[PDB]
Amino acid sequence: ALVKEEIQAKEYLENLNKELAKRTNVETEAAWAYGSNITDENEKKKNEISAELAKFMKEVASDTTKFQWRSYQSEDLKRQFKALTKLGYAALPEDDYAELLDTLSAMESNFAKVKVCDYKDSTKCDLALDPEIEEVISKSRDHEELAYYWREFYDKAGTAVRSQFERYVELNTKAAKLNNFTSGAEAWLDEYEDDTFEQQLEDIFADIRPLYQQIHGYVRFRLRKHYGDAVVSETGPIPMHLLGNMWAQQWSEIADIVSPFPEKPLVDVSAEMEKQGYTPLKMFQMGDDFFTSMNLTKLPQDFWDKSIIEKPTDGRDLVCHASAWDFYLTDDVRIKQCTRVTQDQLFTVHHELGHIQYFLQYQHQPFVYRTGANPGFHEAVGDVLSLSVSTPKHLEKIGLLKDYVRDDEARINQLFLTALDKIVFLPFAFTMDKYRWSLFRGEVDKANWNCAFWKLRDEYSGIEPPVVRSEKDFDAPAKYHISADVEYLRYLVSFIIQFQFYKSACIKAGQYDPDNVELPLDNCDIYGSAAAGAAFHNMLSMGASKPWPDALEAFNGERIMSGKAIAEYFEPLRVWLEAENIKNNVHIGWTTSNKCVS
Numbered sequence: 001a002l003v004k005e006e007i008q009a010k011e012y013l014e015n016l017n018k019e020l021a022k023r024t025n026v027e028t029e030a031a032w033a034y035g036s037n038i039t040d041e042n043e044k045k046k047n048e049i050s051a052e053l054a055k056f057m058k059e060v061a062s063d064t065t066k067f068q069w070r071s072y073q074s075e076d077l078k079r080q081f082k083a084l085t086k087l088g089y090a091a092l093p094e095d096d097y098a099e100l101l102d103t104l105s106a107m108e109s110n111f112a113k114v115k116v117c118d119y120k121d122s123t124k125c126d127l128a129l130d131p132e133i134e135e136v137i138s139k140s141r142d143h144e145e146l147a148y149y150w151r152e153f154y155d156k157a158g159t160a161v162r163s164q165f166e167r168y169v170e171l172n173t174k175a176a177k178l179n180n181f182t183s184g185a186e187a188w189l190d191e192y193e194d195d196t197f198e199q200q201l202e203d204i205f206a207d208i209r210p211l212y213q214q215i216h217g218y219v220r221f222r223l224r225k226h227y228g229d230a231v232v233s234e235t236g237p238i239p240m241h242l243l244g245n246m247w248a249q250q251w252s253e254i255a256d257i258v259s260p261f262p263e264k265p266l267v268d269v270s271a272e273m274e275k276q277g278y279t280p281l282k283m284f285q286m287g288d289d290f291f292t293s294m295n296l297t298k299l300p301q302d303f304w305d306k307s308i309i310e311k312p313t314d315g316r317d318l319v320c321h322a323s324a325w326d327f328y329l330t331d332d333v334r335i336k337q338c339t340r341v342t343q344d345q346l347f348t349v350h351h352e353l354g355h356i357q358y359f360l361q362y363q364h365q366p367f368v369y370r371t372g373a374n375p376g377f378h379e380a381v382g383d384v385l386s387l388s389v390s391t392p393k394h395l396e397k398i399g400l401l402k403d404y405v406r407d408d409e410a411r412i413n414q415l416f417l418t419a420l421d422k423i424v425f426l427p428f429a430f431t432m433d434k435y436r437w438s439l440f441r442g443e444v445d446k447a448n449w450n451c452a453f454w455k456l457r458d459e460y461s462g463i464e465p466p467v468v469r470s471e472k473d474f475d476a477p478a479k480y481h482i483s484a485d486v487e488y489l490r491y492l493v494s495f496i497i498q499f500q501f502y503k504s505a506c507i508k509a510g511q512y513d514p515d516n517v518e519l520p521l522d523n524c525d526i527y528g529s530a531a532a533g534a535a536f537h538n539m540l541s542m543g544a545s546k547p548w549p550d551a552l553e554a555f556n557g558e559r560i561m562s563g564k565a566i567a568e569y570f571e572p573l574r575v576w577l578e579a580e581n582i583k584n585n586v587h588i589g590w591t592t593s594n595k596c597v598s
């Protein structure tokens with residue numbers, strides 16, 4: 001009978017959760033060892049342990065059928081059982097899972113091992129993306145140099161893994177269907193527990209799209225003045241290599257040439273950080289201080305003892321893309337970051353520490369609940385703090401911004417700078433998953449895979465490659481998350497919801513009042529606010545114990561993902577920018593790109 005079984009089920013779940021945590025700890029250690037030290041031996045070890053855990057997950061999913069869990073009274077017990085039925089890749093046959101693992105590591109290791117030759121010195125061929133190539137992309141204003149590095153990188157990080165990527169799509173699809181999802185798109189979207197989630201994002205994106213068009217138009221205008229009309233056309237998509245980022249996902253690195261008021265201050269604290277003798281250790285210590293200042297949890301000793309916060313100086317290959325790690329014990333949390341002393345890197349430190357804080361806040365939950373309310377929540381935490389860290393208000397407090405006058409023009413410069421990171425990213429993030437969803441769903445024939453990628457980048461972002469690409473090239477895997485099989489919609493969601501969190505945290509901190517000119521949203525600093533911290537504790541401690549609208553409700557009483565907050569933040573910029581574009585007769589929109597030959 002059901003009453004007695006539900007008691008037994010509760011006991012079954014308690015033990016199983018603890019067992020899953022312990023088994024996952026072993027897989028995580030091997031995955032950490034591989035990411036920190038790419039070798040054939042470490043690859044073998046990572047993939048063999050994963051195969052072993054997958055085998056156990058299969059047994060668990062099979063064992064859930066022995067319980068009448070759908071009949072139970074407790075929503076909590078039913079939710080835990082449901083989490084256990086979802087196998088993901090573990091649903092694949094033993095041999096298929098092993099092949100998928102070998103395929104994934106082949107792609108991630110290819111990306112991590114990419115080396116190019118120096119533009120000026122064809123004998124020096126040991127430039128890696130991080131930091132060598134990225135330094136050039138961000139700093140060089142030589143369009144031919146930029147285009148050289150773009151082509152070299154994309155050819156090696158992208159085209160080189162086409163066949164592996166094809167097999168990955170096949171096995172991802174097979175796995176999804178064994179879980180009775182239509183494709184991997186539906187498997188990923190299941191994490192958001194909302195059958196209208198795609199439409200919700202389309203609607204929010206449509207509301208912000210006109211603002212993006214205005215920013216795009218103004219940036220293109222300013223780039224024409226710098227590079228000339230031979231490099232940048234008035235009516236065409238922007239050549240992406242000019243945007244200060246390898247993937248044109250954020251444009252803040254070219255702020256010095258596109259800033260609204262060039263005679264007024266533009267915040268760039270990198271030089272002051274170096275001047276004051278900042279180190280990676282100091283940057284992480286300052287992030288820790290920000291969290292502890294809000295009455296949130298201090299970084300444990302394991303973090304300091306075990307984290308990797310600088311690129312290793314021996315000859316080893318590693319994954320340098322920044323990552324935060326939960327080892328599912330108590331207080332064993334780690335970051336691996338190839339940290340550099342720059343402003344943007346200071347934001348990245350706070351982003352990664354946001355993941356760490358989430359791990360610490362929910363470590364008391366049963367294993368299945370030790371994850372974000374949805375994947376976007378996990379990405380948003382640290383970015384909320386980064387928004388405060390980026391303010392002139394905060395940067396003056398820590399002595400990184402000196403002799404700053406916050407007049408009307410300086411404010412527009414700062415809002416524009418933020419928008420180059422926050423608004424610009426939205427169409428980029430949407431296209432990363434729109435692309436993969438289309439391949440997962442079988443909507444694009446293999447013969448059209450590369451130009452389907454550039455078509456999307458054109459349609460949504462109005463950017464294009466520096467050189468003509470074709471189906472001989474395969475450019476998508478040149479982005480880390482595509483080579484490493486990391487869902488990207490989490491970042492689009494994050495960039496929307498982080499403004500909901502920021503706005504509410506600021507109101508709570510007494511730092512934002514829409515009717516008080518002295519308290520604008522774009523200069524809010526939540527440092528030292530226990531009130532803002534209280535809201536974070538309330539939400540993060542839930543982990544995934546409840547559907548995400550309940551986690552949002554715990555923070556600020558709202559239950560809906562909304563574009564209201566991000567639009568509110570950038571409203572003063574929108575008004576100024578629309579007028580500035582009219583004043584300067586700026587062309588808005590773009591013709592279809594000619595840079596991908598079918």
Ligand SMILES: *[C@@H]1O[C@H](CO)[C@@H](O[C@@H]2O[C@H](CO)[C@@H](O[C@@H]3O[C@H](CO[C@H]4O[C@H](CO)[C@@H](O)[C@H](O)[C@@H]4O)[C@@H](O)[C@H](O[C@H]4O[C@H](CO[C@@H]5O[C@H](CO)[C@@H](O)[C@H](O)[C@@H]5O)[C@@H](O)[C@H](O)[C@@H]4O)[C@@H]3O)[C@H](O)[C@H]2NC(C)=O)[C@H](O)[C@H]1NC(C)=O
Pocket residue numbers: 178179180
């Ligand atoms: C994805 O979707 C798949 C379907 O498209 C699904 O696969 C199905 O899972 C079913 C299990 O839930 C399974 O149903 C069983 O079928 C057995 C015989 O099927 C054979 O012949 C079929 C042709 O008709 C073939 O196509 C199959 O390949 C099989 O060879 C039955 O023998 C079996 O029955 C037993 O179990 C039921 C279930 O009992 C339930 O639980 C309690 C038990 O205490 C009951 O009180 C309760 O009422 C409830 O019914 C018993 O009632 C019964 O007495 C038997 O003991 C069972 O019906 C089905 O075969 C399978 N495939 C197909 C094609 O249908 C996947 O499971 C889905 N995957 C995921 C991850 O969700």
Ligand SMILES: *[C@@H]1O[C@H](CO)[C@@H](O)[C@H](O)[C@H]1NC(C)=O
Pocket residue numbers: 037039040041042314316
């Ligand atoms: C990297 O891994 C190899 C074996 O795969 C091991 O011998 C070596 O100690 C590791 N290197 C470092 C720097 O940890």
Ligand SMILES: *[C@@H]1O[C@H](CO)[C@@H](O)[C@H](O)[C@H]1NC(C)=O
Pocket residue numbers: 295530531
């Ligand atoms: C700090 O957090 C604790 C719980 O961690 C809470 O009980 C306490 O009220 C908070 N202190 C302040 C000043 O808000």
Ligand SMILES: C[C@H](CS)C(=O)N1CCC[C@H]1C(=O)O
Pocket residue numbers: 249322323348351491
């Ligand atoms: C550094 C983090 C790791 S979770 C990251 O990958 N981000 C943060 C913003 C977007 C995305 C990217 O770099 O592509």
Ligand SMILES: [Zn+2]
Pocket residue numbers: 351352355378379
């Ligand atoms: Zn992240």
